[PDB]
Design an enzyme around this catalytic site. Sequence first.
Site, PDB file in Angstrom:
ATOM      1  CE  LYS A 259      -4.472   0.337   0.293  1.00 24.15           C
ATOM      2  NZ  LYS A 259      -5.177  -0.619  -0.670  1.00 24.15           N
TER       3      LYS A 259
ATOM      4  NE  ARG B  85      28.412  28.782  -9.208  1.00 22.29           N
ATOM      5  CZ  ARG B  85      28.427  27.568  -9.736  1.00 22.29           C
ATOM      6  NH1 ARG B  85      28.325  27.402 -11.078  1.00 22.29           N
ATOM      7  NH2 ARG B  85      28.540  26.518  -8.919  1.00 22.29           N
TER       8      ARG B  85
ATOM      9  CD  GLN C 295      30.514  19.066  -9.475  1.00 24.56           C
ATOM     10  OE1 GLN C 295      30.218  20.167  -8.993  1.00 24.56           O
ATOM     11  NE2 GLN C 295      30.406  18.788 -10.823  1.00 24.56           N
TER      12      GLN C 295
ATOM     13  CG  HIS D 178      21.597  26.888 -13.916  1.00 22.03           C
ATOM     14  ND1 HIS D 178      22.841  26.611 -13.393  1.00 22.03           N
ATOM     15  CD2 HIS D 178      21.160  25.729 -14.492  1.00 22.03           C
ATOM     16  CE1 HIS D 178      23.169  25.358 -13.690  1.00 22.03           C
ATOM     17  NE2 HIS D 178      22.158  24.801 -14.337  1.00 22.03           N
TER      18      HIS D 178
ATOM     19  CB  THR E  96      -2.861  -3.446  -0.846  1.00 17.24           C
ATOM     20  OG1 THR E  96      -4.095  -3.094  -1.492  1.00 17.24           O
ATOM     21  CG2 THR E  96      -1.965  -4.231  -1.816  1.00 17.24           C
TER      22      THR E  96
HETATM   23  O1  LIG Z   1      -5.690  -6.876  -7.206  1.00 14.97           O
HETATM   24  C1  LIG Z   1      -5.548  -6.680  -5.987  1.00 14.97           C
HETATM   25  N1  LIG Z   1      -4.386  -7.143  -5.405  1.00 14.97           N
HETATM   26  C2  LIG Z   1      -4.114  -7.007  -4.090  1.00 14.97           C
HETATM   27  O2  LIG Z   1      -3.041  -7.442  -3.595  1.00 14.97           O
HETATM   28  C3  LIG Z   1      -5.141  -6.312  -3.249  1.00 14.97           C
HETATM   29  N2  LIG Z   1      -5.197  -5.988  -1.906  1.00 14.97           N
HETATM   30  N3  LIG Z   1      -6.422  -5.346  -1.780  1.00 14.97           N
HETATM   31  N4  LIG Z   1      -7.129  -5.242  -3.049  1.00 14.97           N
HETATM   32  C4  LIG Z   1      -6.313  -5.849  -3.933  1.00 14.97           C
HETATM   33  N5  LIG Z   1      -6.526  -6.026  -5.280  1.00 14.97           N
HETATM   34  O1  LIG Z   2      29.014  23.856  -9.476  1.00 20.48           O
HETATM   35  C1  LIG Z   2      28.928  23.596 -10.689  1.00 20.48           C
HETATM   36  N1  LIG Z   2      29.307  22.333 -11.092  1.00 20.48           N
HETATM   37  C2  LIG Z   2      29.274  21.929 -12.380  1.00 20.48           C
HETATM   38  O2  LIG Z   2      29.626  20.766 -12.711  1.00 20.48           O
HETATM   39  C3  LIG Z   2      28.795  22.922 -13.395  1.00 20.48           C
HETATM   40  N2  LIG Z   2      28.619  22.858 -14.765  1.00 20.48           N
HETATM   41  N3  LIG Z   2      28.143  24.122 -15.088  1.00 20.48           N
HETATM   42  N4  LIG Z   2      27.995  24.976 -13.918  1.00 20.48           N
HETATM   43  C4  LIG Z   2      28.408  24.207 -12.891  1.00 20.48           C
HETATM   44  N5  LIG Z   2      28.470  24.552 -11.562  1.00 20.48           N
END
Ligand SMILES: O=c1[nH]c(=O)c2nn[nH]c2[nH]1
Ligand SMILES: O=c1[nH]c(=O)c2nn[nH]c2[nH]1
Lengths: 295, 295, 295, 295
Positions: A10, A176, A228, A256, A57
């Site tokens: 789920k 920058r 980096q 940017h 589920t």
């Molecule tokens: O197709 C389904 N699979 C499941 O595992 C499930 N669990 N609740 N409803 C469901 N429907």
């Molecule tokens: O910090 C940056 N790393 C990069 O690899 C890069 N490429 N263009 N500008 C950038 N600035």
Amino acid sequence: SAVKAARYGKDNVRVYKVHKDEKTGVQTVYEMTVCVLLEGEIETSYTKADNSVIVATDSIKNTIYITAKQNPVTPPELFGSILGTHFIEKYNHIHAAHVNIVCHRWTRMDIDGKPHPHSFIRDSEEKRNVQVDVVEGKGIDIKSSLSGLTVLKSTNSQFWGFLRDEYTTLKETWDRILSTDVDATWQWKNFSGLQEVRSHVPKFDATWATAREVTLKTFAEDNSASVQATMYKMAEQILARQQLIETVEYSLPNKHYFEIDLSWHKGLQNTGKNAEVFAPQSDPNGLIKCTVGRS
Amino acid sequence: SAVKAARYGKDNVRVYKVHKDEKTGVQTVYEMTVCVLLEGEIETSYTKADNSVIVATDSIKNTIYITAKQNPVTPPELFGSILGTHFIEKYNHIHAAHVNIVCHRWTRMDIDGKPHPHSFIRDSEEKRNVQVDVVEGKGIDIKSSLSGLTVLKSTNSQFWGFLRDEYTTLKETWDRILSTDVDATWQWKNFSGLQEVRSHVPKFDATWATAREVTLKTFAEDNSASVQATMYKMAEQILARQQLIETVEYSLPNKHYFEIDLSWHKGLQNTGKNAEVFAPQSDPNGLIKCTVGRS
Amino acid sequence: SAVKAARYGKDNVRVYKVHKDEKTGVQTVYEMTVCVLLEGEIETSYTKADNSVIVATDSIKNTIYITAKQNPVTPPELFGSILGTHFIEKYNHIHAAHVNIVCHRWTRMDIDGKPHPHSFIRDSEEKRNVQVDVVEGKGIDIKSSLSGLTVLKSTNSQFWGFLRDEYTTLKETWDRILSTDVDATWQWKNFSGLQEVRSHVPKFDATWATAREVTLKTFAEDNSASVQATMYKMAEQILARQQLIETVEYSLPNKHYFEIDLSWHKGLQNTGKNAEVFAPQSDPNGLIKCTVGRS
Amino acid sequence: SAVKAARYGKDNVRVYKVHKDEKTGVQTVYEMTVCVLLEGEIETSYTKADNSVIVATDSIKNTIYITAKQNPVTPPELFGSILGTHFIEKYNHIHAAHVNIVCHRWTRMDIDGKPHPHSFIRDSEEKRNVQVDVVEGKGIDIKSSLSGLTVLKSTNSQFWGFLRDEYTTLKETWDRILSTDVDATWQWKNFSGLQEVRSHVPKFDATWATAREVTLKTFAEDNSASVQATMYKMAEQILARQQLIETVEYSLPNKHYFEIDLSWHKGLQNTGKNAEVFAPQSDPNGLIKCTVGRS
Ligand SMILES: O=c1[nH]c(=O)c2nn[nH]c2[nH]1
Ligand SMILES: O=c1[nH]c(=O)c2nn[nH]c2[nH]1
Ligand SMILES: O=c1[nH]c(=O)c2nn[nH]c2[nH]1
Ligand SMILES: O=c1[nH]c(=O)c2nn[nH]c2[nH]1
């Protein structure tokens, strides 16, 4: 043809939990979105129409609500480990539970300098997340993270010295804007099971806070040679601050902000040292990633 | 067939501006998204293919950047009035300029208790907006607003006494979660023109802060009889606090959080006074609106 | 302070309805999202905490489901009129009902050249909408629309002859990409009530189809002098084709696709007549609007 | 601390390309969003501030535009292989190029039964994607996919026989709505390099069409025992139809449509065999995944 891998469960289960102190009258709310996927002996549900192997589920959803009812939901690393352990212990044919949790911010409001006992504000779209893999026989793998932490600095960022060839048009710069949405993941040493996760509980909130702290301080103080170079220093620090972490990973978009040349208009001066007005760019964006482990 | 109304311009123009203090070394950034639409004698561009009447949307974009370069971008009510006045004074056949502005949060970072001179954090998706209509002969109409202010209180909200009939299934309550995303608009008395808008500049930031403040305090303190009753008290206060406002309008979704009945499971107790775990609902949601003016 | 205007109700109510033919075995599904807001004598719910005047939003939701159960949901103009009439007839103090409906595409699948009896595909994010205002004493106002119709033509669009001055940098062109998301609204002559809306039922689906048809054909065939000139011809035609429409309104973004100059690289030729590779721009975009009525 | 993994490049590069036939006068447009990330000997850019190893992300962007200029952009598997091969051949220290491509629908318009030479419609948000990993010494890995294919069937879907225990509340059914957004990925046998990818070109478009076809037909015709059982039959077929595929993977949300019980109202009958009106649920949703390979 055969089933090589299978998982089902789920997703997008939204959960809110309130804690009510009777002493203080103070309420604390927790909101999260939970995803649980199971693996195990469930091939036949795919190959043979055998539903007998399916924990529905819908039940998985019921279980998330029940477990949140009986246990703390905080820290998420613990709640996730409880929830995933529940499924592999409960069901003989279920051998892995993957739990993903997104925690949403509900920050206590300050009304007139004082913390309000029961009102909160979503003070940012920043998230704290966990990924918990609970695998029969192999313990509990946990990756915690923060994401959606959006920051900008207007100066103290540079980018020069990069490769230049017949594909290059970018001009080197010494001043920058740097702006990014921070995604930072730290992977814990494998835990043997729930007892061991319980034994480290205080480290979870603290390492989270430390990763946030370090992220923010390095971004603000580093006079950055490159994204980096800046993210490596962040990751280096988190690793030094917490021995139970094996790897830190960062994923940083470079959002940017382009100079706008206004000299065509009345010789208006808006570039280089004169740049005041910029055009933030929606796309493209640099994407820069690093995984840092122990040497 | 004839043109009954027409407007055209540039939407989604993202603008960033930095202010650099030389004294303090302190930088302040402003980021916004701007929309300008023009009306005037432009029917022929539609009916006759006569482009001679069109200030090109590309130029409108250029102009936003130029005006942000030559003027303050703050407060947005002023920047919007300058920008809209520019168009109706510049162009003889342009009789109305509508300017819409969204201001994005860039909050100065605190690094180690101290305000960082040049690093910022998008500490919320809350927006401050203006709508400015600058109309030849009719002055300047301004509506300012805050939106995207998301809050929740875990208790001190009630809803009982409402109409009941054969369409009603909702149970009255005396204790509930109230959660909403606040949209609050205050409409200024019409201004005669730019000089008059300049003359009220300090009121803009202040009335904004007051609307935020009041919104937050009333939500947290009112023991709410209904969303309706709570938003009226907010609007009532803003009006009392600022004489230059003619109307306050509120638009409040009710984001429901449903009780989850867990008694089917081992007689687990999670309703009424026992409710700890709730299911936040994505939809539907109540939507509640009010315009409040002077009696 | 006093309440100048007030409205409240339920938004984002998702509704699905299946029609099952017993003869053919053929199923037809309808999915929509409905918003109903009420006005009337409800000031006291705001000013006095008097909930006695509130038809609860939860009931409004129940009612949408009940009305969809007892009536056809198609065409949306009819369903909306039924739903809004229901509220002003049912409740003495409710004087206006505003109903908004978004219809989502579920197109019958073709499996092997033949229409599948019970499987559908969301073949586009295009929507058909209505806004229905049912006002005690004043009949029923209906605006129908299509939105989210995204189209592009790679040539046969031009833009030259526009105003040039010291804000202009845009170059005139005789060949360009035109791309837009079409929003088209047609406003019906006021209807006296439900009986009159029922009496025009076949016109709703047909006028919708005609507005889509005309929109698509004019966009594809017009050698467009401007967006302005192209949308006017669309609106002109819809008006001519349907006498019960008072006004057609169009709202058209211009989604720019910029030439990329590649001559800096090995004198690569990618502009003007040589343009093959373009950079679609996310923002800004021209926004162009027109309301066309009868001369 | 050391760099365990690193990759950097340009994400969200939007690219449009037009093909102009001079014979027919017919235009064909291609729009896509491209992401290229590089790996190689670039640790020093992180650890030592050595930008000398960085092909700037801006250049990567320039290169995408140049390569789209000199080569076909279709099929995406080929364009991606060309683009990724370019980087590992061009740069000695770059050992892996990862290219991701999303293709957006621009379907030729039919105006009056005939294919328009230069107008298109985004007839769905369905995407066709590729992931191409071009690794020095290890060839070219390609995963192609379709995603965002949203479908519903109103009947011929069942879910009974599943595990029941004290977490189960779900009732077995023999008639239900099944709705999903299909994500289907097929992984090609590793190719030795570009020459080999060129040699299979016609298989790419065809296998895509086959995966779409099979997906749609099985969903419509299978009387589904479960999502699990239905997706396996899809994957089984794609594998049988194309020998160059090693694995098919499916990821299927179950978008629930709940019965609405209306018997509280005038004994209105809307459940089981009487169900006409349903509440589509936004969340939670079942998520069901399967990887199918060769036995
Ligand atoms: O197709 C389904 N699979 C499941 O595992 C499930 N669990 N609740 N409803 C469901 N429907
Ligand atoms: O910090 C940056 N790393 C990069 O690899 C890069 N490429 N263009 N500008 C950038 N600035
Ligand atoms: O069709 C157009 N109309 C306009 O008003 C405009 N302004 N720039 N490009 C434009 N294209
Ligand atoms: O505050 C509320 N106002 C309303 O009108 C309503 N209707 N259902 N719940 C509600 N809560």
